[PDB]
Structure 1
Amino acid sequence: AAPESFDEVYKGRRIQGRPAHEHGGGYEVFVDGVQLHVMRNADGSWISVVSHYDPVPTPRAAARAAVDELQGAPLLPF
């Protein structure tokens, strides 16, 4: 089963998640409407191209870690 979708404003940025040279991702995340590449690991944790080496439990947690890392910078399309 895919995780549920989400939509919130986190640290002033809109983060959204939804079930759907880069893999064919079963789930999509956006930060202010720009897609963030995310990936699920076998144990159910998530990572993203902004924070690839530090797994977090959910795609919303990956979106929030990306906003934390970006420190206000716009994401670029991948």
Structure 2
Amino acid sequence: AAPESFDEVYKGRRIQGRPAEHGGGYEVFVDGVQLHVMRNADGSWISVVSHYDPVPTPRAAARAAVDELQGAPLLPF
């Protein structure tokens, strides 16, 4: 079963996640732009801007992406 959806403002940016590059079952958006994310076999997550650094949830991956971006707009993949 997919993780739950989420919607919050994190560090001034809107991050959204929902159940739905790979056939991969969950979508995340930063200010409306989709961020590629992926789930690992042990249930951890990564995103294309933190791809070598597993975190426990898709919200954690979205937050890690906002941290990485330092205010920059995400470009669509």
Using structure 2 for the length normalisation, give the TM-score.
0.99
1:33-70 per-residue CA deviation (whole Å, 9 max, x = no partner) reads 00000000000000000100000000000000000000
Q: State the identity as a percent.
A: 100
User: How many angstroms apart in 2 are the aligned matches of 1:42 and 1:23?
Assistant: 15
Instruction: For structure 1, list consecutive stretches of 5 or more residues without a partner in the other structure.
Output: none
User: How many angstroms apart in 1 are the aligned matches of 2:26 and 2:10?
Assistant: 19
User: How many angstroms apart in 2 are the aligned matches of 1:30 and 1:55?
Assistant: 18
User: How many angstroms apart in 2 are the aligned matches of 1:65 and 1:7?
Assistant: 15
Moved over 3 A (4+): none
User: How many angstroms apart in 1 are the aligned matches of 2:76 and 2:38?
Assistant: 16
User: How many angstroms apart in 2 are the aligned matches of 1:51 and 1:73?
Assistant: 15
User: How many angstroms apart in 2 are the aligned matches of 1:48 and 1:64?
Assistant: 10
RMSD: 0.3
Deviation at 1:10, TM superposition (A): 0.1
Deviation at 1:25, TM superposition (A): 1.2
User: How many angstroms apart in 1 are the aligned matches of 2:40 and 2:70?
Assistant: 26
SS of corresponding position for 2:2:
coil
Instruction: For structure 2, list consecutive stretches of 5 or more residues without a partner in the other structure.
Output: none
User: How many angstroms apart in 2 are the aligned matches of 1:68 and 1:25?
Assistant: 23
SS of corresponding position for 1:65:
helix
